Amino acid sequence: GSSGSSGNDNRPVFKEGQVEVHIPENAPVGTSVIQLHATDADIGSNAEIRYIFGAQVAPATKRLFALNNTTGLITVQRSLDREETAIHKVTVLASDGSSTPARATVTINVTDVN
């Protein structure tokens, strides 16, 4: 028409704030635990959303689980241990181009293995 756009701030949104999952410690390497889909305004996607590790995140979790800083997908990276840890609390942060990114909690319950 006549006028186009003015300009404003905009941030993505996670599918679900917190979600509980049940995966066996012996689970096979390469399994997809949880996937966070947070794309900016449908119209126009000229940005790069990176998913980093939240605050107070143990290193072991980073190795045991591989978090893609390009898609934000979490998949089994190495064998896990129940005896040591039973519940895994990992937080993901998506920053496209705003003041502060969005935070998302993810609880992973380790189930025994026959």
From Swiss-Prot:
Protein function: Potential calcium-dependent cell-adhesion protein.
Protein name, entry field: Protocadherin-9
Location of this fragment in the whole protein: 246 to 352 of 1237
Gene of this entry: PCDH9
Cell compartments where the protein resides: Cell membrane
Ranges for domain Cadherin: 15-114
Sugar attachment sites: N68, N69, N109
Superkingdom of the organism of origin: Eukaryota
